[PDB]
Design a protein around this ligand. Structure first.
Ligand SMILES: Cc1ncc(Cn2c(C)c(CCOP(=O)(O)OP(=O)(O)O)sc2=O)c(N)n1
Ligand SMILES: Cc1ncc(Cn2c(C)c(CCOP(=O)(O)OP(=O)(O)O)sc2=O)c(N)n1
Ligand SMILES: [K+]
Ligand SMILES: [K+]
Ligand SMILES: [K+]
Ligand SMILES: [K+]
Ligand SMILES: [Mn+2]
Ligand SMILES: [Mn+2]
Lengths: 332, 392, 392, 332
C-alpha cells in the first residue's frame, strides 16, 4: 500500500457510510437511496442491510443509466424529499455531467428560488485503488469545482466520512460526496453510532507546524501526514498538515491563515496537475498571501495522462514525490 | 418452453426478422372533424359550456399575447420569444384534464398550460422583460416560465433534461400517497436525447404515475422528422418500454382532453406511466432567431387545420358563440394584453445584487466578497453601467 | 387522411391505448434442441465439418483459458478477470458469420470473437498481465482487449459508449464503399444507457450497415431484468427505431450463426441496421470482484442448457467427435493455455516511460517535462519502486 | 457592445468558418460535417452552401442528441475519416462530456495507439452574446482543460479562426474548437480564400509592452487590447497583450517569457473565477517566474454564478473591471 458524541464502535469507511445512511433513513421519512446494485448492499457493501430494514420502496435499484439516476434524483428533490443517489464509480459520473452542471447546480438560481434540488446528494467511490486503471481510479473533483451551485466533499477517514456525509444529506444544496474507495476496508476507527455532523466548507488542521503548510484531501491526507514525519526526522522541518475536506465552496481562510504563518505551501492531489484543484488553491493563496511567500507554491499531482494500469506505482504523487518537492521548496 | 429470464416468449423454428409498421402506424385518435363536428357520439366528453369557453378563451388569449410579444421582440423590446401557433390545442386540452395540483414539467412551448391555470399576464410579461415583478429575478432567457403556486416547474433550455426529473417527482408523489400525477411535455426532437430513454425506462421499472406528452409538430428547428427518426414516431417507442401509449390529433382539443383525462385516471390508480403523442404542426417559426422560410405547407395548416378554428366551429354549433362575441373577445383580450404589456415595460429591472443570490441557498462568504466587489466597482465606475432602469 | 408530417397513419374514432405484448413476446429462434438435434431441416445451415469443429474448439479453448485466468486472479497473479461462461455460443456463432474484415466493437464479455479470429493466447495473456508483449502497453485493466489486425476495437470500461461509435464507423464504411459491416456487442444492462438510444436512432436515420448484438443474460451484476426494463426485452425496442429485429437462442450456435449471417447480408446490401437479441444466461459471477451467490438456478443452466454441451451433442451425432477426441483436445488445450500462461508470467512489464506516450499522438513539451521529472525521481528514489520487473 | 497567403476577401467570423470548412472538404475526400440543423446552413450560418456543393452524404443533419453526435464522430474518426461535428451551443456540450472525456481523449492512449480518433474536430459557438442567459452564453473551456488527450482552441478573429480551425481539422488529436458567437457577424477582416494554418499550442503577442502582461482569449482579447490603450493614456503604463489561442496544451513558454520581462500579469476570461483556466496559468507562472513577480498575479473573471439574463452588463469582466484591477496591481 502507498499510504463526546456518545457510544462509538470501530468502523471502516464502508461501514461508516452505511451508518450515516441508516441514521438518515431513520430520522428522515422522506429519504430514499437508489442507483445501480444498491438493493443487495452495493458493490462496495455501503448499503448492506438497508433495504431489509427500511423497505424496497426506499432502497432500490435503478436501470443502468447514470444520466437517468441523477435526473431522477433531482426530480425527487424538487418535491422536497431527500434523494441519496449512488454513482457506482466516480469514473462513470460523466454521463450525468449535464444533469449535474446544467440542471442540479442551476436549479435554485434560475428559478428565483421557486424550485430547488437542495435535498439531493450524489455519493460515489473515488480515487486510486492500486490497479483500477483508467476507469476505476479517477478523481473528478476539479471538473465539478468550476460549477457554481454544487458542493463537492471528500473525507479522509471513517469518522470524517460519516459526519461529512450526514452534513451533505442535510445541506440545502445539491452535494457530491466522493468516498475514497481504497479506504473502504482499510483500518477501522471509532465512529459514533448516533448521528453527528462535521461542517462543510471547513478545512481541518490535523497537525500544527511552523515551516511549511501541506494541503491535501481524501487518502492523500495520509500521504502528506507521513511526509510531515519524514520532513521532521530528515530535515528538522515543522509541517502544518491540513485536510481541505470541502472542494467547493472551499475554506480559503484556514488555508491563508496557515500560509501567512509558515510562508510556504505544498498542495498535493491524485488528480492530474493541469486544471486540477491545486491550481485554484495556489492562485488564491498567491493573491492573498503574496507578501508572505518565501518560495513558490508547489503542486505535487498526478501526471497529465489517463490513469494507467501497470504503471500506477509510478503515476501517483506518493510520499517520496511529495517529500522531494518539499525538500526543494525548503531550499529554494 | 424457453427458460431465459430476460423475456417471456415461445420458441420459433423459422428465421423471421420483425419488421417495423411505419407506413400504417399507430392511428390518430380524433373526436371532432375539421368542421368541429363530433364524429363518434360515444366519445364526446360533453364538457359543460363554461369549461369549453375557457378552453377557447385560453387559446385565443395566448394567441393574442404571442402576436404582441413576437412583435415586441422584432422591435428589440425583449431579447427573445417563441410562439405557440398551431399547438394551443395540445396545451389547453391537456391542462383541462389535469387536477390543479398535478405537477407540470415542460420544454418551452407549453405556455397555454399556464394560461389555462390562470397565470397572470403581468407575470408572463415580467419574465420576458426580466423586470422587478419576475419571481425568477430576471435571470433566465424570455419564455423560461415557472410558477410554484400553479405547480409548473421552471423551464430550462437544455432539451429533455426534465424528462427523468419528472419521473423522480412522480416516484416521490407515489411514496407521499399524493394521489397526484406528474405530466411532462417535450417535443419530438427532444425525444431523441438520451435523457428521454432514461426517463421512459425509469418510469416503467419504478412504476411511476406520470404522463409523458410529446408534441410532434414535424420539425425540430430546421430538421424534419424524416431526419429525426425512422420508426413510427414517438408513440411506437412507448410499448418497447412497457408504457401504455396513444397517438392523438393535437389540433382536436377534445381528443387531447379525452386521452389526457384517461391517462391521468389510470396513471394515478395504477402507478404506471402513459405516453401520449399529439400530432400537430408548428405554424410559427421556431423562435425569433429563426426564419423558417429558409427550410420549408404552413398555410395549409393555418387555414385548413388549426385548433382555434376547429373549436370555434364547435362553439358556433352548440350556439355557444357567434361573430359578435368573437369581436368583443378579440377587443377585450387585446386590451388586457396591452395593459399588461405597458405595465411590464415601465417596471424597473431588479437590483443587480440579485445576480449573486440563490446560487446556493446561502451565499458563500467568497461569493459575498464578489458581490461587495461589484458594489465598490459601481461606486467608482457606475456612470458606465445602465444603472437607471435597475432597482436601487 | 391525416396529414401530419411526423407519422403515417389512419384516424381512429375510439380511444384505445396500445398495450405492450410482454407475456408472449417476440419468439426465440432455435435451430437445434438441447440434445443437439436439428428441429427444422430447412433452417439447418449445413456448415462443413472443419468449420463446426472450429466453433467447438474455439468455445472450449476459451473455456479452458477462462478457468485458468479466473484462478490466476484468485491467487493475485493478475488484478482482475471476467469469464465468458454460458455465453461462448453467442461469441463464436456470430463471429463465424462475419467477414474477417468486418469491424467489431464490444463491451468486455466478447473474447470468443477474438478467439475465433485466431487471436494468440500469448496476447490475451499479455493484456491481462500488462507485460511487454501487450500492444496496449499495459495501460488498461485486464480483459480490455483490442487488435487492429483482427479489426476488434479496443474495449473500454464505460458501458454502451461503443454503440454510437460503431454507428459512425458503419457510416464511414458505407461512404468508403467498403462492402463491410460493423457489429457492436453489448449487454442488456448497457442497453439502458442513453448512448444505446443514440446509436439505435442514428443508425436508422443515417442508414448504416451495422448489426447491434445484445447479449441478454438475465443480470447486470446483481440487477435482474425485472429491475432493468419492463418492455419485452431489447428486441422489442428495435422496431420503434425502424430497425429490423430478431431474438435468438444464444445457447444455440446455429441459430446465432443463421441470424448474424442473414443480418450481415442484408445490412451490407441495404445499408440498414439490424438488431439481434441473443437470450442466454450468465453462468459465472459478474467478475472476480463479484460473489454472485449474494443475489441468486445457475446449475439448471450449466447442466441443462449450455452452448458447449449442445454443440458437443450435435458433433457426436454427425459422428464428427467422440470421447477420445474430447479427452485429447481437453489435454492439448490445457497444455497450450498453460504454455502461454507461463510465458506471460515471466515477461517483464513495459518501460515506465510508456505511461507518458500516446496521450496525444506527439508528447507535448510539458508532458515530456513530467516524463523527465519521473526519470530524475527514479534516479534518486528508485530503491522505493518495483523497478525490477519493469523493462529498461 | 462591450468590445502573404494569396488573395483575401473581407469575411466575418461565420464566413471564415465556412471558408475553412469548404477548403477542408475540397482537399480531403474523407471529410464530413454533421450535427443539428447543419444541412440548411446552421443556426449561425456557418455551413451555408456546403451541402449543395459537396453532397448530402457529406454535410448532414443528425438526430437531436449530443452524446450521439460525439460518439458517432469518434466512430467515423476510428476509421481514419475526418469528422467535423457541430454542437449547436457550447452550453449543450455537456451531454457529450462522457464521450469526450472518457472516450475521445483516452482513445489513443488506452489502445497503445492501435486505434485513435485524431481525425475528429468538435466545433461549437461559445461565449457571451448580450442576452444569452444561462444556456446561450457559457464558456466551458476549463472543464475540458483538466482532460489529458484533447486539445481546446479558441480564436479571436476571422483570420485567426480560419487558420486555427484548419489546424484543428488536420491535427492528429481530437480537438474542440470554440467559436465566439458574438463575433460571428461583428466586423469583417481580410481572410485568405485558400487554406493556411496557424499553429496550435502557440500564444500570440499582439502588442509588445514592458510594464504588465495581459492574457486573454476569444472576444476578451479585444477587451484587454482596449485596457492596454486605457492604461497607456491614463496611467502611462505599457502593456504587453497576449492572445493565448490554445487552452490545452497551452503555450507556457510565451507567457512566462513575457512575465519575466514585465514582472506583472493580469489574466482575464468570461468564465467564472473558481476553477477557471486563469487559475492554471496563474499557478504555473508563479512557479516559473516567482523571483520576477512585482505584484500578485490578478485574475479578472466572471463571478461564480450561472450566467444571468438581465444582469449580463454587470456580470462580465469588462474593460472597466480589467482596468481597475490593473490600476491596483500597478500600485501594489
Ligand atoms: C441539449 C440541447 N441541444 C440543442 C438545443 C437547441 N434547440 C433545439 C435543437 C431545438 C429544437 C427542439 O425541437 P422539438 O421538436 O423538441 O420542439 P419544437 O418543435 O416544439 O421546437 S429548441 C433548442 O433550443 C437545446 N436547447 N438543448
Ligand atoms: C457507465 C458505466 N456505469 C456502470 C458501470 C459498472 N458496470 C456495470 C453496472 C456492469 C453490468 C453490465 O451488465 P450487462 O447486462 O450490460 O452485461 P453483462 O451481464 O455481460 O455483465 S459491468 C460494469 O463495469 C460501467 N462499466 N460503466
Ligand atoms: K444536499
Ligand atoms: K429542459
Ligand atoms: K465501452
Ligand atoms: K483533429
Ligand atoms: Mn418539433
Ligand atoms: Mn447482462
Amino acid at each position: 500500500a502507498h499510504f463526546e458524541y456518545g457510544q462509538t464502535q470501530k468502523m471502516n469507511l464502508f461501514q461508516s457510510v452505511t451508518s450515516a445512511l441508516d441514521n438518515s433513513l431513520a430520522k428522515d421519512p422522506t429519504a430514499v437511496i437508489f442507483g445501480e446494485d444498491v438493493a443487495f448492499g452495493g458493490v462496495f457493501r455501503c448499503t448492506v442491510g438497508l433495504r431489509d430494514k427500511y423497505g424496497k420502496d426506499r432502497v432500490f435499484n435503478t436501470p443502468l443509466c447514470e444520466q437517468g439516476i441523477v435526473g431522477f434524483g433531482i426530480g425527487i428533490a424538487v418535491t422536497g424529499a431527500t434523494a441519496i443517489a449512488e454513482i457506482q464509480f466516480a469514473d462513470y459520473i460523466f454521463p450525468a455531467f449535464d444533469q449535474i452542471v446544467n440542471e442540479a447546480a442551476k436549479y435554485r438560481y434560475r428559478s428565483g428560488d421557486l424550485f430547488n434540488c437542495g435535498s439531493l446528494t450524489i455519493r460515489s467511490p473515488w480515487g486510486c485503488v492500486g490497479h483500477g486503471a483508467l476507469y476505476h481510479s479517477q478523481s473528478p473533483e476539479a471538473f465539478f469545482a468550476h460549477c457554481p451551485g454544487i458542493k463537492v466533499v471528500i473525507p479522509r477517514s471513517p469518522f470524517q466520512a460519516k459526519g461529512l456525509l450526514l452534513s451533505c444529506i442535510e445541506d440545502k444544496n445539491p452535494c457530491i460526496f466522493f468516498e475514497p474507495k481504497i479506504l473502504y476496508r482499510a483500518a477501522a476507527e471509532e465512529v459514533p453510532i448516533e448521528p453527528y455532523n462535521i461542517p462543510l466548507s471547513q478545512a481541518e488542521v490535523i497537525q500544527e507546524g511552523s515551516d511549511v503548510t501541506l494541503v491535501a484531501w481524501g487518502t492523500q491526507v495520509h500521504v502528506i501526514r507521513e511526509v510531515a514525519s519524514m520532513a521532521k526526522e530528515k530535515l528538522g522541518v515543522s509541517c502544518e498538515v491540513i485536510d481541505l475536506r470541502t472542494i467547493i465552496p472551499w475554506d480559503v481562510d484556514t488555508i491563508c491563515k496557515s500560509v501567512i504563518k509558515t510562508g510556504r505551501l505544498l498542495i498535493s492531489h491524485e488528480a492530474p496537475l493541469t486544471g486540477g484543484f491545486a491550481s485554484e488553491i495556489s492562485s488564491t493563496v498567491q493573491e492573498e498571501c503574496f507578501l508572505n511567500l518565501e518560495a513558490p507554491i508547489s503542486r505535487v499531482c498526478g501526471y497529465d495522462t489517463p490513469f494507467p494500469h501497470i504503471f500506477e506505482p509510478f503515476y501517483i504523487p506518493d510520499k517520496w514525490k511529495c517529500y522531494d518537492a518539499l525538500r526543494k521548496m525548503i531550499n529554494y | 418452453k424457453p427458460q431465459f429470464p430476460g423475456a417471456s416468449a415461445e420458441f420459433i423454428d423459422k428465421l423471421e426478422f420483425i419488421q417495423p409498421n411505419v407506413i400504417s402506424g399507430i392511428p390518430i385518435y380524433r373526436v371532432m372533424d375539421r368542421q368541429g363536428q363530433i364524429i363518434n357520439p360515444s366519445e364526446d366528453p360533453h364538457l359543460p359550456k363554461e369549461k369549453v369557453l375557457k378552453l377557447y378563451k385560453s387559446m385565443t388569449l395566448l394567441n393574442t399575447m404571442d402576436r404582441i410579444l413576437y412583435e415586441s421582440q422584432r422591435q428589440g423590446r425583449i431579447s427573445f420569444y417563441m410562439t405557440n401557433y398551431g399547438e394551443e390545442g395540445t396545451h389547453v386540452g391537456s391542462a383541462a384534464a389535469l387536477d390543479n395540483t398535478d405537477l407540470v414539467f415542460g420544454q418551452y412551448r407549453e405556455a397555454g398550460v399556464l394560461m389555462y391555470r390562470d397565470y397572470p399576464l403581468e407575470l408572463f410579461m415580467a419574465q420576458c422583460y426580466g423586470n422587478i415583478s419576475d419571481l425568477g429575478k430576471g435571470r433566465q432567457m424570455p419564455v423560461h416560465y415557472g410558477c410554484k403556486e400553479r405547480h409548473f416547474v421552471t423551464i430550462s433550455s437544455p432539451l429533455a433534461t426534465q424528462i427523468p426529473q419528472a419521473v423522480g417527482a412522480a416516484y416521490a408523489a407515489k411514496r407521499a400517497n399524493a394521489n397526484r400525477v406528474v405530466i411532462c411535455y417535450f417535443g419530438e426532437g427532444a425525444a431523441s436525447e438520451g435523457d428521454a430513454h432514461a426517463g421512459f425506462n425509469f418510469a416503467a421499472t419504478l412504476e411511476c404515475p406520470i404522463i409523458f406528452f410529446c408534441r410532434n409538430n414535424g420539425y425540430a428547428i430546421s430538421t424534419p422528422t424524416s431526419e429525426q427518426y425512422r420508426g413510427d414516431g414517438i408513440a411506437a417507442r412507448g410499448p418497447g418500454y412497457g408504457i401504455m401509449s396513444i397517438r392523438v390529433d393535437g389540433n382536436d382539443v377534445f381528443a387531447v382532453y379525452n386521452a389526457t383525462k384517461e391517462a391521468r385516471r389510470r396513471a394515478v390508480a395504477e402507478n404506471q406511466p402513459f405516453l401520449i403523442e399529439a400530432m400537430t404542426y408548428r405554424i410559427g417559426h421556431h423562435s425569433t432567431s429563426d426564419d423558417s422560410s429558409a427550410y420549408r405547407e404552413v398555410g395549409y395548416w393555418d387555414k385548413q387545420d388549426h385548433p382555434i378554428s376547429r373549436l370555434r366551429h364547435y362553439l358556433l354549433s352548440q350556439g355557444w358563440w357567434d361573430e359578435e362575441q368573437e369581436k368583443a373577445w378579440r377587443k377585450q383580450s387585446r386590451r388586457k394584453v396591452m395593459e399588461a404589456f405597458e405595465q411590464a415595460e415601465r417596471k424597473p429591472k431588479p437590483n443587480p445584487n440579485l445576480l449573486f443570490s440563490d446560487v446556493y441557498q446561502e451565499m458563500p462568504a467568497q461569493l459575498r466578497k464578489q458581490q461587495e466587489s461589484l458594489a465598490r466597482h459601481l461606486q467608482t465606475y457606475g456612470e458606465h453601467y445602465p444603472l437607471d432602469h435597475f432597482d436601487k
